Each structure stands twice: as C-alpha cells, then as structure tokens.
Amino acid sequence: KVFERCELARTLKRLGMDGYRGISLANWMCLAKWESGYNTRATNYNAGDRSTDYGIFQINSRYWCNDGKTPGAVNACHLSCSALLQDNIADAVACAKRVVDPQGIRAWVAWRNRCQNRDVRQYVQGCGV
Ligand code: NA
C-alpha cells in the first residue's frame, strides 16, 4: 500500500505518533517520505552486513524484527519482519516507537540528512492533524 500524504498523517495521528516522545507528526512524515515514499511494501537489502530494511519506516532486521536470515541479529520489536510489510501500519508504528524509545528519531540517518533542522511543516499542511 502506498499512502497518500494527508491520509498517512491522519493514520499516524490516530496511532498515537503526534508528539510521541517529543517527535512531531511532521518529523515522522518526513522520515516515512524519504525512507519509503509512504510505501509499506518497500524493502532494501544491505549486502554489506546482510541485513534488510522493511516497510514504510524501513526498519532494519539486525536489531528490530526477525527475518531468519540476518547473522547474529536480534528482534527487539518481537515481530516477524513480514509484519512490517502489511497495508495496516499499526505494527510498524509500534515498532517505530520502540526504535526511538532509547534516544530519539535521530536513530535514522536519513532523518538527520533530510529532516533534521529543516522546514518540515509542509508534510502536514492541510491534512487537519
Ligand atoms: Na532480527
């Protein structure tokens, strides 16, 4: 499922992300946009360490979900990575909160790259969130 911009903002808001641990909806939106283009079916294989990024937030197999093929990996969100590839993003959202639980949304390099210290307001404008 490829989410439309405002549809995703409302979906994220309903799932409890607006201001979650200080992170505004605009920031989460900036992350999902650059990570997957609002695409829940997105996957990215990292040949270097044999891990894979899954779903709309492109959560990595080495630490957060289990795919059975990443060497010495863990499963902090306690879910099959398959769960992060569905149309309903509730699981991805609960796992995204865990990723940021330790120390912020800066967990994703892409967010620091194209979201941190940028004008992100555009991502929620007119969405009624
Ligand atoms: Na894993």
Model description:
Helices cover 30% and strands 8% of the residues. It has helices spanning 5-14, 25-36, 90-100, 109-114, and strands spanning 43-46, 51-54, 59-60. The protein is of the alpha+beta class and 129 residues long. The protein has a single domain, classed as Lysozyme. β2 and β3 form a beta hairpin. α1 packs across α2 (25-36). Sodium ion is lined by residues 61-62, 65-66, 70, 73-75. Sodium ion binds at residues 61-62, 65-66, 70, 73-75. The PDB classes it as hydrolase. Keywords: stability, turn, mutant, hydrolase.
Topology:
Layout: H1 5-14, H2 25-36, E1 43-46, E2 51-54, E3 59-60, H3 90-100, H4 109-114
Antiparallel strand pairs: 1-2, 2-3
Helix pairs in contact: 1-2
Residues 61-62, 65-66, 70, 73-75 line the site of sodium ion.
GO molecular function: identical protein binding; lysozyme activity
Enzyme class: hydrolase
Active site: 35, 53
In the residues, how many domains can be counted? 1
- Helical percentage: 25-40%
**Amino-to-carboxy terminus distance:** 21 Å
CATH topology: Lysozyme
Which CATH C-level class is it?
A: Mainly Alpha
**Cα-atom radius of gyration:** 14 Å
Percent of residues in beta strands? Answer: 5-15%
- The number of distinct helices, counting runs of at least 4 residues, comes to 4
Which distinct ligands sit in these coordinates?
sodium ion
Q: Can you count the beta strands?
A: 3
User: What is the overall silhouette?
Assistant: globular
Disulfide bonds: 6-127, 30-115, 65-81, 77-95
InterPro entries: Glyco_hydro_22, Glyco_hydro_22_CS, Glyco_hydro_22_lys, Lysozyme-like_dom_sf
Enzyme class: hydrolase
Subunit structure: Monomer.
